[PDB]
């Protein structure tokens, strides 16, 4: 099963997460502006390195490193092989491990691309605090998540739109689909208001949504210079 | 002639300068599938060449609907009527040259303001949103897509820079019209998401939320209650 998820992951995420590919492209554009020479980037919950490779293709400074981490050995196996397929001047530390345990040092950029929802709600403040402290001045965090909505009528609409999206995209063709819809119904999501409040609570002077499509989106958080 | 020249290059100009525009058009069509009711009207306000109109129309599977597409640019209208006439569908379209500040909104299951409100003076915007709310049937939807400003200036600067990079990646400046249209864009006054939501609330919408965003451009959906008077 973890290998099966790892095998199909790109196609699964494409068919289930509206705007994913857009976010990944925007992550690259941000990297081009925010990765400073001699600094590092963290990809927290890296899966197969989709965000890592997007950053990496947009770093043209010397002496950087990306640190990519996932606690799934199936994802890590495959991410290390996938990253070895592409040539670039920035090396990557692919580390199998727990994001709640790893230190964040000298970071011009941090990426939580559909990863925070996997922690228990009560552990989410403490990861964000750490990322904040670990970011250099002027550094950026990207936080992409499935959102819940406090207005139940809007929530219903967006749930329906998401369902229509999955239908349009042949989501049910995937063998793994039944077990992934089971995960989504068991997952604990937060609202944008909740995400913003936690970011501010971590120390972030600036945060805003920079992407949304239906019930999925991404915030950018900026540490003052 | 600037009018005719914009209309001629419009699809490419919008594609190179509005991030998310095609995504929004697709979302509009999705929303139409669920929201357009038999025997009702849809309004496309500031229709340009009819892109939003055609997206809705392709997603209407019910009888006795009508779409009303309105713009006050003669060059946009002429081409929009021709563009609509080029595609077969059961739902008819009234293509009207006129001002959306003047037009009545009746029996509407859906109304679309896809990059149009920004072209009115700020002091005209509330009145138009009030009229839309009143003219929507209960359960109906407004789509409001805009270039936003940001109340946090550091975020605003960032998203301004990202928009710049987007236009550069897409060769926007290849277009002869780009210099003049960039300038005219910097003259129309944009509002924050907070302002948009406040306006929607004060027009009477019981529910509203951002449903799309990409950098400094995005889209709100606003719903009239099913039990509304
Ligand atoms: N505590 C944890 N520590 C480390 N990894 C974890 C933990 N909990 C979950 N994971 C890992 O977080 C990843 C989530 S996926 C990220 C997409 C990727 N970012 C992408 O941009 O393509 C999105 C999804 O599957 O919805 C999985 O690979 C888990 O192994
Ligand atoms: N007061 C007015 N009354 C009527 N029309 C107006 C008025 N003011 C401006 N317009 C018209 O509003 C349209 C704006 S475009 C709309 C895109 C379209 N919705 C699309 O989804 O492709 C976006 C852009 O030009 O950036 C133009 O066609 C104007 O002539």
Ligand 1 site, residue A51, Cβ cutoff 6 A: yes
- Resolution of the PDB structure in angstroms: 1.7
Mutate to test the interface with A, among B212, B218, B222 (most CBs of A within 10 A): B212
Helix locations, chain A, DSSP H: 2-16, 20-34, 50-57, 73-84, 121-134, 152-168, 177-186, 192-202
The per-residue DSSP string of A73-96 comes to: HHHHHHHHHHHHTS--SS-EEEEE
Task: Out of A158, A206, A211, name the one closest to residue B155 (CB).
Answer: A206
The phi and psi torsions of A76 (rounded to 5 degrees) equal: -65, -50
**Total Cβ atoms within 10 A of residue A84:** 10
Task: Out of B30, B211, B213, name the one closest to residue A164 (CB).
Answer: B30
B133 in contact with chain A, both atoms CB, cutoff 8 A? no
Task: Out of B209, B213, B221, name the one closest to residue A210 (CB).
Answer: B213
For a mutational test of ligand 2's pocket, the pick from B119, B121, B182, i.e. the residue with the most ligand atoms closer than 8 A to its C-beta, is B119
| Residue B178, both tokens | 């780009």
| Contacts A22 to B, Cβ<8 Å | 20, 23, 214
Chain A, 26 to 85: residues with Cβ < 8 Å from chain B are 26, 29-30, 32-33
What's the rounded Cα separation, in Å, for the pair B22 and A16?
19
Q: What angle do CA A59, A69, A13 make, to 5 degrees?
A: 85
Chain A, 176 to 205: residues with Cβ < 8 Å from chain B are 205
CB of B175 within 8 A of CB of B200? no
What's the rounded Cα separation, in Å, for the pair A114 and A116?
6
What's the rounded Cα separation, in Å, for the pair A119 and A100?
9
Angle between helices A73-84 and A2-16 (to 10 degrees): 70
Domains of chain B in start order, with CATH, are 1-229 (3.40.50.150)
Nearest CA to ligand 2 atom 24: B115
The answer for residues whose C-beta is within 8 angstroms of residue B182's C-beta and 6 or more apart is none
């Amino acid at each position: 099963f973890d290998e099966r998820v790892a095998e199909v992951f790109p196609d699964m995420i494409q068919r289930s997460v509206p705007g994913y590919s857009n976010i990944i492209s925007m992550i690259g554009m941000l990297a081009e502006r925010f990765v400073q020479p001699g600094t590092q980037v963290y990809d927290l919950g890296c899966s197969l390195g989709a965000a890592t490779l997007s950053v990496r293709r947009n770093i043209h400074h010397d002496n950087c490193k990306i640190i990519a981490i996932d606690n799934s050995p199936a994802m890590i196996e495959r991410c290390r092989h996938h990253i070895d397929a592409y040539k670039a001047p920035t090396p990557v530390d692919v580390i199998e491990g727990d994001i709640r345990d790893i230190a964040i040092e000298n970071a011009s950029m941090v990426v939580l691309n559909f990863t925070l929802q996997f922690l228990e709600p009560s552990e989410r403040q403490a990861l964000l605090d750490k990322i904040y402290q670990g970011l250099n001045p002027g550094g950026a965090l990207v936080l992409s998540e499935k959102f819940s909505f406090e207005d139940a009528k809007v929530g219903e609409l967006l749930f329906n739109m998401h369902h229509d999206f999955k239908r349009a995209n042949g989501y049910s063709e995937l063998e793994i689909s039944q077990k992934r819809s089971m995960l989504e119904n068991v997952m604990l999501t937060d609202s944008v208001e909740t995400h913003k409040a936690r970011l501010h609570n971590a120390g972030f002077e600036h945060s805003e949504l920079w992407f949304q499509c239906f019930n999925f989106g991404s915030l950018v958080a900026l540490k003052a210079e």
